[PDB]
Amino acid sequence: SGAIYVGNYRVVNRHLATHNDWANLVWEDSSRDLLVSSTTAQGCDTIARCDCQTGVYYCSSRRKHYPVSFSKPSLIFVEASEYYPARYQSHLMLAVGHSEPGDCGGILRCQHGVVGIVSTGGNGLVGFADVRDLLWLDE
Ligand SMILES: COc1ccc(Cl)cc1CC(=O)N1CCC[C@H](C(N)=O)C1
Ligand SMILES: [Zn+2]
């Protein structure tokens, strides 16, 4: 579990969304695993606008923060599950590090702010869904 709160928006994993997230829907995308909904209060998370390839992420299964090197956003094959069948997920970044299914929602950060959230993992690797291209979140 985990979400990003910026201004009047809430950013969550599409497969972990609630009934209140769908009733106050702004934008959704299956191939990215993302969902955005509206909120009454004003959030204070700073979203980064950069080309960084190193940062720090939170891992709830270990209760630790870990520094990692990661790849550029691209299409990567994701195996079948109970939420989505076998497909290619777009805007995905990979890193070497520990990960478990309950860790989806953990925030990735750099010196400029928020980069993305935990989405995929396994075999000793970890995947992050990028949010730096969505300029409408700041306006
Ligand atoms: C961080 O999640 C994991 C970590 C380790 C392992 Cl063995 C497995 C997982 C779970 C995982 O990758 N998915 C199941 C939920 C939907 C995800 C998606 N974005 O399509 C894919
Ligand atoms: Zn940066």
Side-chain angles (χ1 to χ4, degrees):
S1 36
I4 307 173
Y5 302 99
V6 47
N8 279 319
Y9 299 114
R10 168 171 137 117
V11 184
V12 305
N13 284 92
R14 196 199 188 262
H15 77 269
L16 290 178
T18 77
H19 283 291
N20 224 59
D21 278 315
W22 279 98
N24 287 314
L25 184 67
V26 176
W27 172 73
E28 55 91 13
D29 196 2
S30 268
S31 75
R32 288 182 75 161
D33 189 44
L34 287 186
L35 195 138
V36 169
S37 68
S38 56
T39 54
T40 48
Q42 206 83 18
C44 308
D45 264 327
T46 290
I47 306 300
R49 305 299 185 195
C50 72
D51 65 330
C52 282
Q53 274 175 262
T54 60
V56 184
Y57 84 100
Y58 178 70
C59 175
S60 77
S61 77
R62 285 297 181 271
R63 299 207 200 106
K64 278 175 174 91
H65 293 269
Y66 292 119
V68 290
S69 288
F70 54 92
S71 80
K72 297 209 159 174
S74 54
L75 275 164
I76 279 105
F77 185 75
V78 179
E79 256 273 277
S81 82
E82 70 164 318
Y83 315 104
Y84 305 104
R87 71 201 221 278
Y88 279 107
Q89 180 160 126
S90 65
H91 300 264
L92 194 66
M93 306 175 290
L94 291 179
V96 176
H98 179 68
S99 186
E100 281 191 48
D103 293 323
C104 283
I107 280 164
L108 173 74
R109 251 193 157 95
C110 73
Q111 69 185 100
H112 313 91
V114 166
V115 181
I117 55 156
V118 172
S119 198
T120 58
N123 290 314
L125 310 149
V126 55
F128 303 95
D130 189 67
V131 307
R132 307 176 278 175
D133 62 301
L134 313 163
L135 304 174
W136 56 269
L137 291 174
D138 266 311
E139 59 189 42

